[PDB]
Design a protein around this ligand. Structure first.
Ligand SMILES: OC[C@H]1O[C@@H](O[C@H]2[C@H](O)[C@@H](O)[C@H](O[C@@H]3[C@@H](O)[C@H](O)O[C@H](CO)[C@H]3O)O[C@@H]2CO)[C@H](O)[C@@H](O)[C@@H]1O
Ligand SMILES: OC[C@H]1O[C@@H](O[C@H]2[C@H](O)[C@@H](O)[C@H](O[C@@H]3[C@@H](O)[C@H](O)O[C@H](CO)[C@H]3O)O[C@@H]2CO)[C@H](O)[C@@H](O)[C@@H]1O
Ligand SMILES: [Ca+2]
Ligand SMILES: [Ca+2]
Lengths: 241, 233
């Protein structure tokens, strides 16, 4: 119903705790949102249930950094902790390995193996239940947050070379770390037994998420942001050297 | 049911860190508490969770001063640091801009741009999680803290002209600070998608907080402390 088409990739199943990494190059342009996040499905329901989410979001107007966030509390009464972390090279000019770690005690954010943020206690204590690993591309109506939507830069693409999901195994990981490699997806194709393609929208989103904007090419999964009814990738997949 | 009615204004959302300012004129009478504070809702639950809160409280016994405080620890076993700072002219006699800065390193209180207190580390290292911005008007049953309640001075009103909330953006702040203005509310109207009205009470509070005592008139949010039944003006 809206004038633009975005996309959202998500694990069919959710999990309690773990380490999640994704090798990707973000899409950026004033007004857009390119992300990677853990999400407890149903959090948007306003029946009093809590909200559980952890984010990494590249705000289009500033590809030089990404926003970190944990969302607890509940629909209509959120509790947030937005922070900004520089990235070099910019999110849309190079591939970076973004990591997300979640345990009952902390949530950690890493870029190319380096920690950029670690929250202990507080909101982490309310990240109850399970969360699934998600990635979406869209545009926000809040111009103050992401900037005015620059429609002319479209179509835009977010490339994910691979994803690695780990289990929470405190102190038993390499070097006494807290995680163990569970499954890896090199995206040589789309795995419908593992991932799902979003086809919905939410308040504040200028676009409609569609399965038409998620596909693989040359070993990479691509999320596309295109004008409504202009969904295609005839371009070329960058190389992750 | 208490014999008096108070009021509390609070943001529906909570955040981690930031700057909070409020242009106000406080209520003051012996035994009353007129305030502005950061609060981690749920802190009052004695289930083991920690207590997180930063206060600014005008004790009715002395309107020419206000009490600062950081509450940590937990319900039934709090860690406090009550301190008192002079305010001129008295808080109930003029408008002052009260500021509250909360970062992971310190918490700073300001009156009209002037720093009246700054706490680094210590309790500040224990202000984990998020907090909402709140304001209330009530009366305490602790005589030594606020003084015997002087009913004859009712109704009392606390006026809030405007509120500004800033995000903690270290290094990329405005005006040479680590803060970026997020939102403002001149209170020309009451924004229910932003604020909530208290409708409870607690031990030591001789009043019941009610939506009946919160309203906006001529670009100003008003908090009233009146005897139960007479809530208006
Ligand atoms: O709206 C119906 C649809 O909702 C999906 O869940 C949405 C949810 O509604 C959104 O609020 C949420 O938005 C995230 C923000 O909370 C966060 O600040 O930023 C991230 C990154 O941009 C946002 O995605 O997104 C989820 C997922 O799209 C349900 O999954 C779906 O079943 C339901 O039909
Ligand atoms: O009692 C149920 C009700 O509690 C609200 O939280 C209260 C809490 O119970 C009070 O202890 C607290 O008191 C504050 C003092 O700790 C501080 O020294 O000074 C401030 C300002 O003078 C006091 O308000 O206040 C909070 C907020 O009213 C919960 O928010 C509510 O959900 C619950 O139903
Ligand atoms: Ca690949
Ligand atoms: Ca005003």
């Amino acid at each position: 119903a809206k004038d633009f088409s975005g996309a959202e990739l998500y694990t069919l199943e959710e999990v309690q705790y773990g380490k999640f990494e994704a090798r990707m190059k973000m899409a950026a342009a004033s007004g857009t949102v390119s992300s990677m996040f853990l999400y407890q499905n149903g959090s948007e329901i306003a029946d009093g249930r809590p909200w559980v989410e952890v984010d990494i979001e590249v705000l289009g107007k500033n590809p030089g950094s990404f926003q970190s966030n944990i969302i607890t509390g509940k629909a209509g009464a959120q509790k947030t902790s937005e922070k900004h972390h520089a990235v070099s090279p910019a999110a849309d000019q190079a591939f970076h390995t973004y990591g997300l770690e979640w345990t009952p005690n902390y949530v950690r954010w890493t870029v190319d193996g380096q920690e950029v943020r670690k929250t202990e206690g507080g909101q982490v204590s309310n990240l109850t239940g399970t969360q699934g690993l998600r990635f979406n591309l869209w545009s926000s109506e809040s111009a103050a947050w992401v900037g005015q939507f620059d429609e002319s830069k479209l179509p835009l693409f977010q490339f994910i070379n691979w994803v690695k999901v780990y289990k929470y195994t405190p102190g038993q990981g390499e070097g006494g770390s807290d995680f163990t490699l569970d499954w890896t997806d090199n995206f040589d194709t789309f795995d419908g037994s593992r991932w799902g393609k979003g086809d919905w929208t939410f308040d504040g989103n200028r676009v409609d998420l569609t399965d038409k904007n998620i596909y693989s090419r040359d070993g990479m999964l691509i999320l596309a942001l295109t004008r409504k009814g202009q969904e295609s990738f005839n371009g070329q997949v960058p190389r992750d050297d």
